[PDB]
Amino acid sequence: MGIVPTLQNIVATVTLGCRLDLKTVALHARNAEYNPKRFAAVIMRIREPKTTALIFASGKMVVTGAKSEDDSKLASRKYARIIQKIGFAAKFTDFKIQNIVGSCDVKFPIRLEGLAFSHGTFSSYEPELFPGLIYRMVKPKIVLLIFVSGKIVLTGAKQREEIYQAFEAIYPVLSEFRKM
Amino acid sequence: MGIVPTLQNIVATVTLGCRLDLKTVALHARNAEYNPKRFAAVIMRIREPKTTALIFASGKMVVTGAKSEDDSKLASRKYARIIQKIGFAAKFTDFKIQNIVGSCDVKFPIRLEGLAFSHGTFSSYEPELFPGLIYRMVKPKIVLLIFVSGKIVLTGAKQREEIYQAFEAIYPVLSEFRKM
């Protein structure tokens, strides 16, 4: 954690084009996992990059784990590669980023009680229920988790610019709410 | 069979439409934290309904702590006495609710990983970053924190009925990912 936000995880969905039969893919893709009773989705996995993919019987695929849009764009292609070879006529289509989670550390203790009262229609602070303050930004639609230590978590960004811009908006507020 | 959300805290803001000499009323009230160099307003209080109250010279006050819309309103009336009997135009008026937070326990661990990766549209989940899963409802505007133990926190409702509404709509989802 440093002052500059760094993305932690990226979730993207790829539409394969065709409906799959999960049993055959779990029975041909050398690296896969299936549990129809517990969850209707073949959980595949790869190393370059380390992303996990959830292939659903509708062609819809959800790839998590990448730290960059290049890696989730890359990884997604390769997963489509893995099923194509098995036999189905899948094709990398409509890659859409679903959510991005990032973090940073302003490096100074913050008065969550003061920020909660001041930015009252945005914040919530119930220490006995959750340690952090939940801040709901309406633009960009980001939900920030702010901890008494200075740690920050920005969840919900549909694209990289929103994580960075959300921090620009909150920083000068936090810096005005540090202790002492 | 009933599982229903309880109200943990209601933050209300009501205005005693009249100017208030904060030094004075802090004096009389005596056990009211009024202090220089910081926050210009008097912090009142009461044993029951156990609520804290930030009174501002702008005639406005923000009462916190009430576990119910009626108790708040009640604590909102108590305060316009301690600062009325002291000859003042403490006119109780425009009472508004700023936020309502609830909590609930479904009593079955949840498979958050499955919820998040199939509901990434709303869910934010990073076990190495923060505890729990963040779910953002669009209708009604509510942010729910869901933990593995099955305890959930509902925040941001401006009205009571939205807590029940939010939980009534997410419960079937949580039952689907109930870890057995």
Q: Quick one: A107 and A92 in the same domain?
A: no
Q: In the PDB record, what is the listed experimental method?
A: X-ray
Q: Which residues of B touch A11 (CB under 8 A)?
A: 117, 120
Distance CA B158, CA A35 (A): 41
Q: Quick one: A49 and A111 in the same domain?
A: no
Q: Which residues of A touch B129 (CB under 8 A)?
A: 8, 101, 103, 153
Distance CA B84, CA B28 (A): 12
CA-based nearest distance A156→chain B, Å: 7
Rg (CA), chain A: 20
Sequence-distant (6+) residues with CB within 8 A of B19 are: B57, B59
- Is the distance from CB of B179 to CB of B121 less than 8 angstroms? no
Cα–Cα distances in Å, from A126 out to A15, A163, B50, B66? 40, 25, 16, 13
CA-based nearest distance A41→chain B, Å: 10
Cβ of residue B62 closer than 8 Å to a chain A Cβ: yes
Q: Quick one: B75 and B112 in the same domain?
A: no
Nearest CA in chain B to A146: B130
Distance CA B22, CA B13 (A): 17
Distance CA A102, CA A110 (A): 19
Which of residues A67, A97, A127 is at a domain's end?
A: A97
Residue A177 tokens read as 């709410």
Q: Quick one: A76 and A17 in the same domain?
A: yes
- Tokens 């943990």 -> residue: B8
Which of residues A48, A67, A97 is at a domain's end?
A: A97
Q: Quick one: A138 and A88 in the same domain?
A: no
Q: Quick one: A30 and A5 in the same domain?
A: no
Best residue in B14, B35, B134 to probe A by mutation, most A CBs within 10 Å? Answer: B134
Q: Quick one: A137 and A176 in the same domain?
A: yes
Q: Quick one: A160 and A118 in the same domain?
A: yes
Full domain range(s) for residue B113? 1-11+98-180
Of B9, B54, B132, Cβ closest to residue A126? B9
Which of residues B43, B70, B97 is at a domain's end?
A: B97
Q: Quick one: A7 and A17 in the same domain?
A: no
Q: Quick one: B61 and B74 in the same domain?
A: yes
CATH of the domain at B154: 3.30.310.10
Q: Quick one: A34 and A80 in the same domain?
A: yes
Q: Quick one: B28 and B91 in the same domain?
A: yes
Please enumerate, as own/partner, the contacts of B131-134 that have beta carbons within 8 Å and a separation of 24 or more: B132/A130, B134/A134, B134/A143, B134/A145, B134/A155, B134/A156
Q: Which residues of B touch A130 (CB under 8 A)?
A: 132, 145, 153
Question: Which residue, among B109, B101, B103, B77, has the nearest Cα to B91 in the 3D structure?
Answer: B77
The domain tally of chain A equals: 2
- Tokens 């989802």 -> residue: B173
